[PDB]
Amino acid sequence: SATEKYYIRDAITKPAVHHESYQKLWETKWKKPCEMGVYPFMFGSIKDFEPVAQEIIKKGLKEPYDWDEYAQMYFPKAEELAKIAEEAEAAGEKEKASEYYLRSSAVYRISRFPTPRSEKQKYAWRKGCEVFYKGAALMEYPIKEVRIPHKHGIEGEGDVVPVNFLLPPNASETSPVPCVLIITGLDGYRTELAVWQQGWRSKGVATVIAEIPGTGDSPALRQDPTSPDRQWSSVLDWIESQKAVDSKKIVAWGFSTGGYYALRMAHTHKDRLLATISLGGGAHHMFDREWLEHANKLEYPFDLSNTLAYKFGYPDLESFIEESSKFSLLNDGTLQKPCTKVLLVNGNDDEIFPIDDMFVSLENGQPKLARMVKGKKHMGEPESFSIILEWIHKLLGLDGKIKEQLAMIPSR
Numbered sequence: 001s002a003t004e005k006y007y008i009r010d011a012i013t014k015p016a017v018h019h020e021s022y023q024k025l026w027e028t029k030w031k032k033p034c035e036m037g038v039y040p041f042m043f044g045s046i047k048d049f050e051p052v053a054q055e056i057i058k059k060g061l062k063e064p065y066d067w068d069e070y071a072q073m074y075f076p077k078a079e080e081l082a083k084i085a086e087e088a089e090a091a092g093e094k095e096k097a098s099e100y101y102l103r104s105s106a107v108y109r110i111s112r113f114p115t116p117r118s119e120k121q122k123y124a125w126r127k128g129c130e131v132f133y134k135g136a137a138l139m140e141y142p143i144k145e146v147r148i149p150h151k152h153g154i155e156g157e158g159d160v161v162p163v164n165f166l167l168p169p170n171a172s173e174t175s176p177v178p179c180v181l182i183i184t185g186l187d188g189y190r191t192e193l194a195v196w197q198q199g200w201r202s203k204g205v206a207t208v209i210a211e212i213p214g215t216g217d218s219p220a221l222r223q224d225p226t227s228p229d230r231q232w233s234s235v236l237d238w239i240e241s242q243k244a245v246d247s248k249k250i251v252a253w254g255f256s257t258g259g260y261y262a263l264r265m266a267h268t269h270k271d272r273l274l275a276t277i278s279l280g281g282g283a284h285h286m287f288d289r290e291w292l293e294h295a296n297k298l299e300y301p302f303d304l305s306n307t308l309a310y311k312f313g314y315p316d317l318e319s320f321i322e323e324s325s326k327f328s329l330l331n332d333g334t335l336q337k338p339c340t341k342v343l344l345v346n347g348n349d350d351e352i353f354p355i356d357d358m359f360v361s362l363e364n365g366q367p368k369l370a371r372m373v374k375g376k377k378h379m380g381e382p383e384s385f386s387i388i389l390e391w392i393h394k395l396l397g398l399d400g401k402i403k404e405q406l407a408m409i410p411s412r
């Protein structure tokens, strides 16, 4: 029975209120993080989103969403902010231009949540990236796009791995810096996790941000479990070519769905990584029929299981569930292989990926570092971020000033 299968027990049968309407999503889940300027509203302002939310609520939009109808609600605000940014840049107001380009990028971003599954959402992805990089270019320490040649790609794969790159000042072959490789999630891509880069730069750490297969601009085959392996071979070849980066001090940090990829590459690329971190990742039970047949109605803001199916290149959930077992790090033998240093962190009560997958990760191969966060759901925030930064600071011998670093994340 499904109600007795997983750690959270009968919690999987209780539908979350935010699935009733956008009004319930805004009031019970999204308004607070929007006000606080945190995921999924990094770089964003409540001043931009509240008026849009008011118009969506008046229209009474709800599941099942028409994603073209949904996306269009955000475009007037996104365009308004982009025009304010363009005027500021022309006047030499660098700081103001940067702010409004990034505020524009945030509005485009939410219009194509949870993943671009319509023409207007695919449009919003391209528009979001354009204004993001315009804003990124006008930062004091500019974040740049690098189109890494996908030299390890095979037939049907893209020619480049587009990544964010930030190198601290005074980094050189003579004085090389560690690199945190951030692996993004199912809905948050390189334009979202970018919020972490200035913090790392301030601690003398380079950052590269790359998307998982079937998200953002990942060139990887969606249905091929080995496609991430090729992508990381291309990305790590490129990092090793950057002599200002110490390629003996590459730390991979996977966020949410990215955690699966961070855990996987700890095995596939052991000798090229100092450590990997899975924050709210899965490994095995995340691919279960039982888990996936319940997850659409739980803590995820939209349809988690359907979004996962799309990201893995399946036309519907049933087709994904029929083949999903082949992605398991247990089933495909990954977890039996030696791994580099691994840190697993998650909330016990996660209703996006089960904590049961931390157990599977700890039940196979070499010992791994773990922190469980009791009484917290997906990502075990906020303590998870302090746990991970404390550990990375010790690993890389940084200043250990993690409060100062975390204080830079909220948008203001």
Ligand SMILES: Oc1cc(O)c2ccccc2c1
Pocket (backbone or CB within 6 Å): 039, 184, 185, 186, 188, 193, 195, 255, 256, 379, 381
């Ligand atoms: O900064 C963040 C915080 C989160 O809770 C995230 C969750 C999923 C993906 C990216 C995130 C980034």
